[PDB]
Structure formats: structure tokens, C-alpha cells
Amino acid sequence: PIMRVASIDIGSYSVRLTIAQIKDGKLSIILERGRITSLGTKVKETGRLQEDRIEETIQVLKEYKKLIDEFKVERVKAVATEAIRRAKNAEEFLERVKREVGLVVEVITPEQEGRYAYLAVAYSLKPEGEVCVVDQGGGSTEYVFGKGYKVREVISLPIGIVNLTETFFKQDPPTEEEVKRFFEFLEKELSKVKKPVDTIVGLGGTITTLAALEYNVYPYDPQKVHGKVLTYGQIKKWFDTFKEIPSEERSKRFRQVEDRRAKVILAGIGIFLKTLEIFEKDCLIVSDWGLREGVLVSEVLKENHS
Numbered sequence: 001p002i003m004r005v006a007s008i009d010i011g012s013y014s015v016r017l018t019i020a021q022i023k024d025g026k027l028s029i030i031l032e033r034g035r036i037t038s039l040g041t042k043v044k045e046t047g048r049l050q051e052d053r054i055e056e057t058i059q060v061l062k063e064y065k066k067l068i069d070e071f072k073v074e075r076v077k078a079v080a081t082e083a084i085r086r087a088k089n090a091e092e093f094l095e096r097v098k099r100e101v102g103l104v105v106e107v108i109t110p111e112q113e114g115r116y117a118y119l120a121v122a123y124s125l126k127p128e129g130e131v132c133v134v135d136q137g138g139g140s141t142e143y144v145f146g147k148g149y150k151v152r153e154v155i156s157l158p159i160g161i162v163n164l165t166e167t168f169f170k171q172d173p174p175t176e177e178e179v180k181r182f183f184e185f186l187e188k189e190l191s192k193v194k195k196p197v198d199t200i201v202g203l204g205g206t207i208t209t210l211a212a213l214e215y216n217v218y219p220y221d222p223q224k225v226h227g228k229v230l231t232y233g234q235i236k237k238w239f240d241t242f243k244e245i246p247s248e249e250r251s252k253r254f255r256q257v258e259d260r261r262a263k264v265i266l267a268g269i270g271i272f273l274k275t276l277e278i279f280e281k282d283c284l285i286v287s288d289w290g291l292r293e294g295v296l297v298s299e300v301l302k303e304n305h306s
């Protein structure tokens with residue numbers, strides 16, 4: 001019989017709901033919602049989640065729970081990112097969610113996010129041989145190694161593209177020397193995760209935007225992007241293109257680039273370019289699915305155990 005499953009992901013910017021049906025082993029997404037609640041507001045400065053952001057987040061979660069109830073979702077898993085954990089009143093916020101929404105939200109590590117993203121790829125792409133999933137987003141890039149559905153090792157590198165951009169790219173766009181320093185740093189960090197692999201799979205907003213650009217996909221359509229290959233050469237040419245374009249012009253020239261990602265996209269592209277160089281691989285496969293969908297996969301595997 002068909003079963004419905006759902007995931008909720010609470011980040012520093014948005015709270016997101018994904019509902020899927022599973023029918024003869026096939027997962028199809030049937031509902032998605034997203035609301036920006038900016039839970040990370042002033043956490044760096046005050047060490048705390050702000051009350052107005054908590055209250056809005058609780059109201060969104062109530063609305064998501066109403067949908068889960070009406071849609072008769074049988075399995076629900078809710079997670080929060082380590083950026084929420086950074087806050088000092090996170091535990092008190094999560095207790096309110098238990099009491100007022102009826103939902104447990106698990107604070108998960110970046111490594112665990114990687115483990116879920118890896119499951120998404122295992123299901124949605126079935127990559128062969130020794131696999132490394134490279135998941136860039138939310139302040140980090142995870143490198144998740146395994147074979148089939150089995151994760152062997154996950155390494156999370158805290159090389160967030162906002163920080164890399166601010167650190168290295170003092171000009172907009174950066175000078176050639178700034179680009180050089182950025183790559184020297186990435187060589188230092190990425191050489192530590194290098195392992196022999198058969199297949200690299202790339203995830204996140206940077207790489208799916210790159211795939212849409214390379215393959216002339218507009219508007220964005222996951223069916224046209226998921227499973228596309230990008231070679232080192234293709235990624236290098238996009239890096240070289242964006243390094244010559246001021247950030248404010250990028251979304252004007254290339255419509256698929258979101259305004260809010262336009263400045264940091266170059267750093268993102270560099271992570272993937274240097275990754276391919278260091279791992280000595282000529283290409284990667286793009287996934288449209290990651291954490292949010294991997295939580296759904298995990299729920300299906302749990303249902304089928306025993």
C-alpha cells in the first residue's frame with residue numbers, strides 16, 4: 001500500500017516541509033513548503049535565538065503539522081542544523097516545539113546531514129563503485145564516501161562560500177591574486193580528504209545552477225538537471241566566466257543565477273573545480289536531491305527493515 005512520509009528541515013534562514021509518497025519502492029514528492037523565518041538573526045552577536053523568530057518558526061511548524069495531519073503522513077522526521085545548536089536557548093526552543101506543535105526536532109551535525117544527502121543520492125542516482133558525494137551549502141561542504149547505500153566515512157569541511165568570499169575576494173570580482181590565494185587554501189584543505197573514487201556526485205545550489213547554465217535549462221527543471229554530467233573543463237570555463245563578471249551583473253547576464261547567490265557563486269564553483277583536480281577525476285554527476293529528500297529515503301528504509 002502507498003505510504004506518505006515527510007521531512008522538516010529547520011535552518012538559520014528557512015523552515016521547509018517535504019511530503020512524498022512511496023508506491024512500489026518509488027518515492028515521488030507531492031508537497032513542498034518553505035518559509036523564511038531567519039532563526040539565525042543576531043545569534044552571532046547575542047548568542048541567542050530571538051523571540052520573534054522563535055514565535056514565527058513555531059507558527060510555521062504548526063501549519064506544517066496541520067498539513068501532515070490532513071495528508072495522513074505516516075512517518076515524519078524533523079531536523080535542525082548545527083547553526084541552531086550554536087544558540088544558547090536552542091534547547092528551550094525545541095522543548096516549546098515538543099509541547100506546542102507535538103513534534104520532536106533532532107539537532108543534527110553537518111556530518112549527519114551528509115549521511116542523509118548520501119542516501120538521497122543512493123536512491124535517486126544509484127552511482128556505481130566507490131562514491132564520494134560532495135554537498136556544498138549552509139556554511140560547509142561535506143565529503144561522504146561509500147558504496148551503494150553504505151556510508152563508510154564523512155568529512156565535513158567548514159569552507160562556507162560566504163566566508164571564503166569575504167576572506168579572499170576583497171575586490172568584486174576578485175583579482176587574479178585573490179583567486180590564487182583562494183585556490184591555495186582549497187588545495188591545503190581538500191588534499192586532506194582526497195581518496196580514490198569511481199564516481200563523484202555534486203550537490204547544492206552552486207552545482208545545480210551550473211548544470212542549468214551548462215545545459216541551457218531555463219526555467220530550472222529538476223528533470224533536466226538531475227543526473228547531468230559536468231566535466232572539469234566545463235566547470236573551469238564557468239569559473240573563468242564568473243571571475244570576469246561583477247556580482248551585481250551576474251544574475252542579469254545569467255538568469256538562472258539567483259540574486260542572493262550571485263556574489264558567492266564563484267567560490268562555490270571553485271570548490272567543485274578544485275575537488276575534481278585534487279581527486280584526479282574528470283567529471284561529476286549532479287544531484288537535485290540532498291538532505292531533505294534523504295530524510296525521506298531514510299524513513300522508507302526504516303519502514304522496510306525487519
Ligand SMILES: [Ca+2]
Nearest residue numbers: 135136137140
Ligand atoms: Ca553542506
Ligand SMILES: [Cl-]
Nearest residue numbers: 139160162163
Ligand atoms: Cl560561510
Ligand SMILES: [Cl-]
Nearest residue numbers: 137139160161
Ligand atoms: Cl556553503
Ligand SMILES: [Cl-]
Nearest residue numbers: 137204205206
Ligand atoms: Cl549555495
